[PDB]
Amino acid sequence: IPETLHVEMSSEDVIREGDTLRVKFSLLNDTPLSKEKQVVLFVDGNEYSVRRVVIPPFKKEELVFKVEGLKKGEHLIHTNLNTRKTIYVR
Amino acid sequence: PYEWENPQLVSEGTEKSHASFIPYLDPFSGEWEYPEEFISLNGNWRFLFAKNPFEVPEDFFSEKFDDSNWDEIEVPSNWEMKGYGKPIYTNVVYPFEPNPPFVPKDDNPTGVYRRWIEIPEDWFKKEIFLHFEGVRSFFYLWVNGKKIGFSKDSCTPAEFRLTDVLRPGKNLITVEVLKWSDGSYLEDQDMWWFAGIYRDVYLYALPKFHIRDVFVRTDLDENYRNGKIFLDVEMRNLGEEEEKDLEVTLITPDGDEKTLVKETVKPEDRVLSFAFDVKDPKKWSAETPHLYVLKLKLGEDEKKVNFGFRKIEIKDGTLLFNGKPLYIKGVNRHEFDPDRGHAVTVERMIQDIKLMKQHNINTVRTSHYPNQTKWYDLCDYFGLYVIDEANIESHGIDWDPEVTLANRWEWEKAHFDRIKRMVERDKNHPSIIFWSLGNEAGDGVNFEKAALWIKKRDNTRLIHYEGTTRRGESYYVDVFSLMYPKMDILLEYASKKREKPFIMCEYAHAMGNSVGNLKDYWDVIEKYPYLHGGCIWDWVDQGIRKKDENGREFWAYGGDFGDTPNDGNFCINGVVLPDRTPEPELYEVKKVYQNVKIRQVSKDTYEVENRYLFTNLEMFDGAWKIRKDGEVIEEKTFKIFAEPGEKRLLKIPLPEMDDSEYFLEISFSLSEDTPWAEKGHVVAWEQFLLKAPAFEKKSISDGVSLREDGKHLTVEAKDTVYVFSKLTGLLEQILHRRKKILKSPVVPNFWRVPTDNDIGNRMPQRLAIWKRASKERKLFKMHWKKEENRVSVHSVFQLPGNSWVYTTYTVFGNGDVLVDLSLIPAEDVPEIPRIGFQFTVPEEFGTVEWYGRGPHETYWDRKESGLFARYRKAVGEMMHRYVRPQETGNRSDVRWFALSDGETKLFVSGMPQIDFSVWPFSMEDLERVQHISELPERDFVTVNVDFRQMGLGGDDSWGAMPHLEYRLLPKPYRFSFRMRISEEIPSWRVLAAIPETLHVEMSSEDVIREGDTLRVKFSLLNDTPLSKEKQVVLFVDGNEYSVRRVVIPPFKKEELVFKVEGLKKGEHLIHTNLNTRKTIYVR
Amino acid sequence: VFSKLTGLLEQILHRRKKILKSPVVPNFWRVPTDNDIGNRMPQRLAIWKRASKERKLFKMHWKKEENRVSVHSVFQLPGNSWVYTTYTVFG
Amino acid sequence: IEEKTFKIFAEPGEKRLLKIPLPEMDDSEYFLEISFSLSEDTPWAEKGHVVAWEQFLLKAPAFEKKSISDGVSLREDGKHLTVEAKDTVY
Ligand SMILES: [Mg+2]
């Protein structure tokens, strides 16, 4: 059987120092088995947060991560599910 | 003082600027038209070349002088392209010693042209003019022995009234051209320094009372429905007495005629002004270039002007064209030809425009001087937007307010003349939407005053100058413009209210293998307010066609003509090669610039968005195609009705699907022929995954043999023998039916041949340790392990920089080999250029097949243009010939590839994907040679099989890096692929089965005190033949507490410690995602 | 009489007689006093003297009703300040 | 002062633009009304029944302030103040 989830990551392109970044993730299961997944968020190469998800067949789950404490400059946000983005802190 | 060293003398003896009337392009036939009283002076002239103006023979300009021993040169031309002197390339530095306004007297290449011409008798009841379309950089004119005057700006015309000094029958024309003048201080563009009469020369005759000039402007009402024409007609009298009849006729795009004016006018110098109303005129755009014609006749004087109804305006910081938001999808173009230099023909101009429109370009910037008049006529007829730029650049002079020529009172009239001569020549073309004042020439009063003159003369176009907006807001421009800005600059401009739109006059520097992250700029431009697009730097590589010693052609650049000082290959910045052959990066531009957007709602439902301003999608033929493991199984045509801005739904009925991979492609093509392209040309496409494949894992039962000696381990399976070295730790040979497949061993590889962007950011110095780690290594340990159905060979290396690399080869009884790599970088090493393996096979492997992105090369930050399908090529056509050889030939997101020698196939499949490339030479050969001609002949093929390579970048080519998301930062990485040598291509979807589970143990303290820290230890043992990447998650009372990423090479144990803080009195559950659980007691 | 190239009110004709010898212009300058010279006002405030003589017409439009017409001009000035002029003529 | 009929083509969910040419206006207050009615009889209602309408201010009025020159008289007694103007007594 096919064994892969369909993923999309999204957030704000630019925030102000002191503000919070909201990172949204959609996971779609179009396979015939339920999937258990650890979704890990990395900030500048370092592990920042993790969520356990169970996704039944023919279902979409939505997650939000809140990222605090980002100082002025540009930052890489990435996951263990092959999604990557640059974010700019004004 | 010499007139060619005096900035305050701009010309002498020349007529006043006016609008172009000769030649005239007929928009109904597309044919060029000339006046009745016209004599071309193109052809052969007697020519004399001198090293400076003082080495010219005396009395060269007299009728009596003998020139019968002079050489003959063809006009128009640059004389550096005919054999005389040498071409010089400099970026910013002047090719003489900078000391304005002084030019050298010793070395100043000089040319003298002589020609005899026959004026008919009936011309002398009229007024006679001599017209020079362009001369670089300065010239003196003599007619029948007498001095008439001189001229100084290389890119705008010079006209002289000669009715007095000319006689019936045979007359002499003599011209002396100087290469360098005071004018040269404002012509410091990053380009080749040439010289000569490089554009057309002619004689024509007008009546004594004639139309000198015409200014036609249009307005549109608040509904962009009805129009007005505003016409200024300037008349000039040179000794006429009788009254003449003036007629003005309007011809519509359909072909209908109407008389606007018919009156009698007494002969005098006057400007007549008229205003007319027109109902529902056809509007001009780049999508729909409808042209009206004004026919003007005063006595026997006849002229014609093409014009269009169109309006450019700024409303609340937004750029509007005929009432719609306009996005500039542009390129910078130099007027350059590899055989003729600046003397470009109409045939080449037409080739440039059709290629631009076939790649979704809508705008051209004339970088950085006015082009020939026929360029603007063709942009009116075919439909491109134009940014027309004045010939002013003084980069080599410092931009400090006291130093810059933009603030010096003696350079004031030179700046004004160059701007005014452009505007007066080009003011009637509907294609021109912006006037640009110049490029990289500092800021000051000399620009401020010329910019206020333009706005009071012409209120129908916007003014642009990046030299003022780079210092902040400026009151005398309408557009905010920057060169090569980073993404944070665009997001900052869009974050507050603005009165002016933001345009990038240069971005995405295309020097060498480049144009990375193009889609990331356009995702920001289309989402945020006040951002209206930009022009890519640039269209065509300025390479000169030359022959080497053996007589094989190459493209020449700085320092290939003994020219010193030079700036090397910094003139090679194109998206097409000098002969107009596309570079692979032009396919990315076409994809990003397309005017249809397609979104997936569900697997069978697609939303289509029309982003054309004035075109209905009903003009295009729709098609969709479904591919099964890369081959077409279903095709269907459709038509969709969508107006500008509309979103429409498209429903596609899907078939029942098996265990293959399925991709959908949706495209739009031309329904019928256009002036710029043929029926079936694709204007837009998008692709979507319908279904991922189901991978098969097969149990192998057949056996494998193993023989050891003092230097070699030998592994036999079916009819393949694998030979491993105990001294190098490498796979050294593969024998298939007693035939050698390898010409060199399989080695780990971390290097790519530096691009022009890599050189500009010092990648070869910064990342030099990874080049060493690709050639030298120390074998620390080597062992093997046999089972019933397979053998594994494990090698451990330490590298320069102190990083570790683990290789594992597992040979199965069916002849498959699994190849695994883990890289563990040391704590103080920099980012990695590439991660993969490199080997060589014999040149008999001459054909390649693949399932992946194609058909052209793609990279991590430049791959949207790569369509997923099955492709086939010869090895020699799997690389691009960049003018300076560089990294080339990568194929991305590949499921499988196969090399064939006719009988035997070398097959590689990804787990689940790889990148690859194949070259007919070594990495060392590619890094050494600096010209295409020097690439040597070899009896082997180099094969690269990669996890990934870092992006190309190209925000600029003098410091910018690839974006953070396209770099390999130093952390642990793993990678594997399958290889088979056989007579047929096996199924990429079928692999050998292996065990896939780690052995884990968790341990900690049973009891702690409140305030103390719990230490949880984890051991992970990998006894499988593949490296494992794992997220280890620790839970405390059901809630996620901490996570660690681990890479565990084969036959290795890793140990982790987690510290748990803040546990209060009582009992607590500690557990992981790896099936370990414990109760802990807090005393 | 309004100019579409300068954006200024250029002439007023009353019973065919000219009232203006030069156009109506926005003005930000005064001729420096002895106190102004002593505190360097002519150097410090020199941008407002330039803004009184030079300007760039950015936009110009008009709107007619039954009993009046309005003529609106938008200028940018030296120093990058904005000035809006509006003339409303009644019946 | 002005009425006009029109027809607009819009499918369920679609937004369509409607352009209304305005007259020259004096110092009065001007309101626009846009309505939709039944083209022909239904089982539940007759032709011309309104199903939807909306109204919008086009132009606010110009208020006039007039200088009064005429006089007012005043008589006091023990219980009443009496004010006379034209032919009204307060
Ligand atoms: Mg290039």
HEC letters along B798-833? ECCCCCEEEEEEEEECCCCEEEEEEEECCCCCCCEC
Sheet bearing C56-64, strands edge to edge: C56-64, C68-76, C82-90
User: Which of A12, A37, A50 best probes binding to B when mutated, by most B CB atoms within 10 angstroms?
Assistant: A50
Q: Which among B817, B780, B590, B607 has a CA at the least distance from the CA of B700?
A: B817
Neighbour count for residue B1001 (Cβ, 10 Å): 13
Partners of residue C85 on adjacent β-strands: C73
Structure tokens at B615: 């075109």
Structure tokens at C48: 């407002």
Phi-psi group of B1042: left, alpha or beta (phi > 0 → left; psi -120 to 50 → alpha; rest → beta): beta
Which residues does chain C have within 8 Å of residue D25's beta carbon, measured at their own beta carbons? 65-66
The Cα–Cα gap between B53 and B550 comes to 38
The Cα–Cα gap between C78 and C82 comes to 9
The Cα–Cα gap between B381 and B32 comes to 12
Instruction: Write the DSSP symbol of residue B575.
Output: S
Q: Which among B396, B394, B388 has a CA at the least distance from the CA of B419?
A: B388
Phi-psi group of B492: left, alpha or beta (phi > 0 → left; psi -120 to 50 → alpha; rest → beta): alpha
**Chains near C (3 or more Cβ pairs under 8 Å):** B, D
Q: Mark out the alpha helices in B526-617 (DSSP H runs).
A: 585-593
Shortest Cα distance, chain A CAs vs residue B695, angstroms: 7
The rounded radius of gyration (Å) of the Cα atoms in chain B is: 36
Amino acid (one-letter) located at B860: W
CA dihedral B158, B159, B164, B169 (to 10 degrees): 100
Partners of residue B662 on adjacent β-strands: B628, B691
Q: Which residues contact B872 (CB under 8 A, 6 or more apart)?
A: B847, B848, B849
Cα of first residue to Cα of last residue in chain D, in angstroms, is 40
The residue with tokens 């144009």 is B515
Neighbour count for residue B608 (Cβ, 10 Å): 21
Structure tokens at B802: 């102190």
Burial class (CB in 10 A: 0-12, 13-18, 19+), B210: buried
What phi and psi, each to the nearest 5 degrees, are found at residue C77? Answer: -120, 160
Amino acid (one-letter) located at B258: K
The Cα–Cα gap between C89 and C63 comes to 11
- How far away, in angstroms, is B884 Cα from ligand 1 center? 10
Shortest Cα distance, chain C CAs vs residue B476, angstroms: 6
Q: Are B839 and B845 in contact (CB under 8 A)?
A: no
Residues in chain D: 90
User: Strand B731-736 and strand B739-740: pairing?
Assistant: antiparallel
Which residues does chain B have within 8 Å of residue C28's beta carbon, measured at their own beta carbons? none
The Cα–Cα gap between D82 and B850 comes to 108
CA dihedral B768, B773, B774, B775 (to 10 degrees): 100
- CA angle at B858 for the pair B590 and B693, rounded to the nearest 5°: 105
The residue with tokens 């090679």 is B572
Residue in B314, B452, B475 closest to C80 by CB: B475
Instruction: Write the DSSP symbol of residue B281.
Output: P
Q: Which among B214, B219, B322, B234 has a CA at the least distance from the CA of B277?
A: B219
The Cα–Cα gap between B803 and B823 comes to 7
Instruction: Write the DSSP symbol of residue B393.
Output: B
- How far away, in angstroms, is B362 Cα from ligand 1 center? 20
> Does the beta carbon of B473 lie under 8 angstroms from any beta carbon of chain C?
yes
The Cα–Cα gap between C25 and B328 comes to 37
The Cα–Cα gap between B265 and D62 comes to 52
CA B397 from centre of chain: 29
Structure tokens at B31: 């044919």
The Cα–Cα gap between B805 and B819 comes to 13
CA distances (Å), origin B838, targets B155, B744, B805, B896: 53, 9, 15, 17
C80/B455 touch (CB, cutoff 8 Å), yes or no = no
Q: Which among B292, B299, B220 has a CA at the least distance from the CA of B249?
A: B292
Q: Which among B495, B379, B1012 has a CA at the least distance from the CA of A19?
A: B495
Q: Are B182 and B101 in contact (CB under 8 A)?
A: yes
Cα of first residue to Cα of last residue in chain A, in angstroms, is 47
Q: Are B4 and B137 in contact (CB under 8 A)?
A: no
Q: Reply yes or no: is the peptide bond before residue B368 cis, omega within 30 of 0.
A: yes
CA distances (Å), origin C9, targets B219, C12, C23: 22, 8, 6
Element (H, E) at B265: strand B257-265
Q: Which residues contact B640 (CB under 8 A, 6 or more apart)?
A: B608, B617, B618, B622, B648, B650
The Cα–Cα gap between B844 and D45 comes to 86
Sheet bearing B328-333, strands edge to edge: B462-464, B432-436, B385-389, B363-366, B328-333, B531-536, B502-507, B480-483
CA distances (Å), origin B877, targets B11, B510, B872, B920, B1033: 54, 22, 10, 10, 49
Neighbour count for residue A89 (Cβ, 10 Å): 17
Contacts by residues B805-810 (CB-CB < 8 Å, ≥ 24 positions apart): B805/B748, B805/B777, B806/B1027, B806/B1049, B806/B1050, B806/B1052, B807/B729, B807/B748, B808/B1025, B808/B1026, B808/B1027, B808/B1049, B808/B1050, B809/B722, B809/B724, B809/B731, B810/B994, B810/B1025
The Cα–Cα gap between B569 and B511 comes to 9
Instruction: Write the DSSP symbol of residue B385.
Output: E
Q: Which residues contact B721 (CB under 8 A, 6 or more apart)?
A: B714, B715, B733, B734, B735
Coil, helix or strand at residue B1021:
strand
Q: Which among A35, A28, A25 has a CA at the least distance from the CA of A1?
A: A35
> Does the beta carbon of C64 lie under 8 angstroms from any beta carbon of chain D?
yes
The Cα–Cα gap between B916 and B205 comes to 67
Q: Are B301 and B207 in contact (CB under 8 A)?
A: yes
Q: Which residues contact B108 (CB under 8 A, 6 or more apart)?
A: B51, B52, B53, B178, B179, B180
The Cα–Cα gap between B857 and B12 comes to 56
Q: Are B466 and B481 in contact (CB under 8 A)?
A: yes
The rounded radius of gyration (Å) of the Cα atoms in chain C is: 17
Residue of C nearest to B315 (CA): C59
Q: Are B362 and B326 in contact (CB under 8 A)?
A: no
Partners of residue B627 on adjacent β-strands: B632, B663
**Chains near A (3 or more Cβ pairs under 8 Å):** B
CA distances (Å), origin A6, targets A59, B47, B376, B728, C30: 11, 72, 50, 43, 71
Measured N-to-C along each axis, helices B585-593 and B518-525 cross at an angle, to the nearest 10 degrees, of: 20
Residues in chain C: 91
Instruction: Write the DSSP symbol of residue B737.
Output: T
Q: Which among B632, B973, B942 has a CA at the least distance from the CA of B821?
A: B973
The Cα–Cα gap between B584 and B383 comes to 25
Shortest Cα distance, chain B CAs vs residue C35, angstroms: 30
Burial class (CB in 10 A: 0-12, 13-18, 19+), B664: buried
Q: Which among A8, A63, A57, A2 has a CA at the least distance from the CA of A29?
A: A57
Catalytic residue at B440? yes
Sheet bearing B712-717, strands edge to edge: B705-708, B712-717, B720-725, B731-736, B739-740
CA distances (Å), origin B767, targets B756, B962, B968, B969: 15, 14, 12, 12
Q: What one-character-per-residue DSSP string does B875-942 give?
A: GGGSS---SS--S---EEEEEEEEEE-SS-EEEEEEEEEEEEEEESS-HHHHHH--SGGG----SEEE
Neighbour count for residue B316 (Cβ, 10 Å): 10
How many CA atoms within 13 Å lie on the side-chain side of B650?
25
Instruction: Write the DSSP symbol of residue B289.
Output: B
Residue in A4, A38, A51 closest to B692 by CB: A4
Q: Which residues contact A88 (CB under 8 A, 6 or more apart)?
A: A13, A14, A15, A73, A74, B487, B488, B491
Q: Which residues contact A15 (CB under 8 A, 6 or more apart)?
A: A21, A70, A87, A88, A89, A90
Element (H, E) at B772: helix B768-773
Q: Which among A32, A33, A10, A31 has a CA at the least distance from the CA of A22?
A: A10
Measured N-to-C along each axis, helices B412-426 and B445-457 cross at an angle, to the nearest 10 degrees, of: 30
Partners of residue B621 on adjacent β-strands: B669
Q: Which residues contact D14 (CB under 8 A, 6 or more apart)?
A: none
> Does the beta carbon of C53 lie under 8 angstroms from any beta carbon of chain B?
no
Instruction: Write the DSSP symbol of residue B409.
Output: G
Q: Which among B967, B715, B640 has a CA at the least distance from the CA of B830?
A: B967
Q: What one-character-per-residue DSSP string does A42-90 give?
A: EETTEEEEEEEEEE-TTEEEEEEEEE--PPSEEEEEEETTS-EEEEEE-
Burial class (CB in 10 A: 0-12, 13-18, 19+), B1039: exposed
Q: Which residues contact B459 (CB under 8 A, 6 or more apart)?
A: C4, C5, C57
The residue with tokens 């090369």 is B857
Structure tokens at B844: 């008999």
- CA angle at B200 for the pair B199 and B202, rounded to the nearest 5°: 150
The Cα–Cα gap between B230 and B216 comes to 6
- How far away, in angstroms, is B675 Cα from ligand 1 center? 28
Resolution of this entry, Å: 2.0
D26/C64 touch (CB, cutoff 8 Å), yes or no = no
The residue with tokens 């890489």 is A76
Structure tokens at B1081: 């007691």
What phi and psi, each to the nearest 5 degrees, are found at residue B306? Answer: -85, 140
The Cα–Cα gap between B210 and B1069 comes to 101
The beta strand positions in B630-726, using DSSP E, are: 631-638, 647-651, 662-670, 682-691, 696-698, 705-708, 712-717, 720-725
CA distances (Å), origin A44, targets A63, B491, B803: 20, 21, 21
The Cα–Cα gap between B535 and A36 comes to 48
- How far away, in angstroms, is B870 Cα from ligand 1 center? 27
Please state the three-class secondary structure of chain C as a single string. CECCCCCCECCCEECCEECCCCCCCCCCCCCCCHHHHHCCHHHHCHHHHHHCCCCEEEEEEEEECCCEEEEEEEEECCCCCEEEEEEEEEC
The Cα–Cα gap between A5 and A63 comes to 14
Coil, helix or strand at residue B407:
helix
Phi-psi group of B734: left, alpha or beta (phi > 0 → left; psi -120 to 50 → alpha; rest → beta): beta
Structure tokens at B1065: 């009195």
The Cα–Cα gap between B990 and B695 comes to 6
- How far away, in angstroms, is B573 Cα from ligand 1 center? 5
Q: What one-character-per-residue DSSP string does B334-345 give?
A: ---BTTTBT---
Q: Are B806 and B796 in contact (CB under 8 A)?
A: yes
A3/B695 touch (CB, cutoff 8 Å), yes or no = yes
What is the b/e burial string over B78-110, where b = at least 16 CB atoms within 10 angstroms of the residue's CB? bbbbbebbebbbbbeebbbeeebbebeeeebbb
Q: Reply yes or no: is the peptide bond before residue B401 cis, omega within 30 of 0.
A: no
> Does the beta carbon of B524 lie under 8 angstroms from any beta carbon of chain A?
yes
CA distances (Å), origin B751, targets B754, B892, B943, B948, D80: 9, 17, 14, 11, 109
Neighbour count for residue B273 (Cβ, 10 Å): 9
Catalytic residue at B506? yes
How many CA atoms within 13 Å lie on the side-chain side of B974?
19
B1031/A40 touch (CB, cutoff 8 Å), yes or no = yes
